[PDB]
Task: structure prediction
Amino acid sequence: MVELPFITPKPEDELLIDPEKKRKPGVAAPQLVAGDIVAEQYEVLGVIAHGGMGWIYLANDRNVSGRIVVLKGMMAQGTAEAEREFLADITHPGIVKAYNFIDDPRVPGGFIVMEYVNGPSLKDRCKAQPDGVLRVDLAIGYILELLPAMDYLHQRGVVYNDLKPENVIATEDQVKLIDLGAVTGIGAFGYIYGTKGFQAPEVATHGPSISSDIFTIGRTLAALTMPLPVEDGVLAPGIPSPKNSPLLRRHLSFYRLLQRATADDPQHRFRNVSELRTQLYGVLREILAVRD
Ligand SMILES: [Mg+2]
Result:
């Protein structure tokens, strides 16, 4: 019975990045500006973030009165029409909705057109703390809140692939997964757009699976609760040892869970989300019992 703290959404006059602010060296101006029209349907309003795949735009949808949408870059034959069909067929309150897939000559790769989620990301919430990490019981609460969205994908034979604090948005008293473009079928072929430091080691060689999604849940939960060593711009593999982490010495069952979720061998992890949820509830109770 986790009660997530209500996060008030930011006002509309604070959604866009200010175009008159100087940019950090190495970043190019947005290719679309306010007033541009994409695919004779979306009226560009501005940018909300600059990600690894480029700028991320906000726009008005003419087909539905008052609808505001995100234009996010798609990653690079006939199955492509079937995969886009599946993404628009996803129906779950914990997953951002996909409305369309469009092209524009000014932005190579095209856009996915998706619902805008107002709240801040879990990475933003971590940054709001003096040590840059969340309270362990609260981080577990966030993980438990996104497990239904993950298990829904798994029941459809697909995986999220790129779970990490920056693409989980906390709005009101809920969380939404927002990285729709990363979803693939279980066992899909081709390059999987996970993130090094979060992705399971076997994805590049055997493809993604429910087990590899479990792995990203464990790494995400670790990144939310403790500083993690970095090696060449990548979170180092493994969970820190209890002998080096006072947090993990305090909650040894939390360490055991993180280690099991991120075991090298996929056969040594949790088999599915429900099996992980059960152990998460137990760890949360042991944590609340030791602390209080
Ligand atoms: Mg991603």
The CA atoms of residues 197 and 235 lie 4 Å apart. The domain at 12-115 is CATH 3.30.200.20 (Phosphorylase Kinase; domain 1). The two ends are 17 Å apart (CA to CA).
